Design a protein around this nucleic acid. Structure first.
Ligand SMILES: [K+]
Ligand SMILES: [Mg+2]
Ligand SMILES: [Mg+2]
Length: 155
RNA sequence: CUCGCGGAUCAGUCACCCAAGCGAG
C-alpha cells in the first residue's frame, strides 16, 4: 500500500502504555495495522519539549488508526491537565505551508471542518509543530484532514 | 557491503534501531 509518515508527540507518562511490557503492545499494533512505529528513547525529547517522538510509516488508514490509539493512551494519565485533550504533530515545513494556506485560509477551514482548535509553531530544523485541541471526535477529524495534507504533497 | 545469531550500555510497561563478540553469503 501507498505509505506515508506521521510524526506524533508522546508525553512521557504515555510511552509505557504505548510500548507495553516486553514491547508486546507496540509490536501487536504494528502487526494489526501494517504500520512501522519507532519511538525516540526516553530522555530524547523534541527540541523545546518534554515529549518523545513517535515516527509512524503506513497507509493513510494505518496512520489514522495508529494515531487514535496513541490519543487513547494519552487520554489516560492521572499521576499523583490540558495535555489529555491535545494532539501534537511534527510536519515538514512544506506541508505546514499547505496546512496553513494563503492568509491562513486552509487552517481556518480545517478548524471549521473539525470542532478542533489547531495551532502551529512560528519559525524558530525544517519541521513545525501542529497542536490540535478539542474533544476526541474533533481532534480525530482534524488529524484526518492533516494526514490528508501530508498525503497531498511532493515533499 | 549485506544478512543471521547475539544483546554491552542506555532504557525501564522501553520494543525496534544500535555496541562487544560470533557466523554466513
Ligand atoms: K539484530
Ligand atoms: Mg535481534
Ligand atoms: Mg546487529
Amino acid at each position: 500500500g501507498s505509505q506515508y509518515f506521521l510524526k506524533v508527540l508522546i508525553p512521557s507518562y504515555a510511552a509505557g502504555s504505548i510500548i507495553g511490557k516486553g514491547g508486546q503492545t507496540i509490536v501487536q499494533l504494528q502487526k494489526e495495522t501494517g504500520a512501522t512505529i519507532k519511538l525516540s528513547k526516553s530522555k530524547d525529547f523534541y527540541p523545546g519539549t518534554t515529549e518523545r517522538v513517535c515516527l509512524i510509516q503506513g497507509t493513510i488508514e494505518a496512520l489514522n488508526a495508529v494515531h487514535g490509539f496513541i490519543a487513547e493512551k494519552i487520554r489516560e494519565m492521572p499521576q499523583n491537565p490540558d495535555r489529555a485533550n491535545q494532539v501534537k504533530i511534527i510536519v515538514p515545513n512544506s506541508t505546514a505551508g499547505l496546512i496553513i494556506g494563503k492568509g491562513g485560509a486552509t487552517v481556518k477551514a480545517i478548524m471549521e471542518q473539525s470542532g478542533a482548535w489547531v495551532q502551529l509553531s512560528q519559525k524558530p530544523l525544517q519541521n513545525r509543530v501542529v497542536t490540535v485541541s478539542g474533544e476526541p471526535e474533533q481532534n480525530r477529524k482534524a488529524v484526518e484532514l492533516i494526514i490528508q495534507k501530508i498525503q497531498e504533497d511532493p515533499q
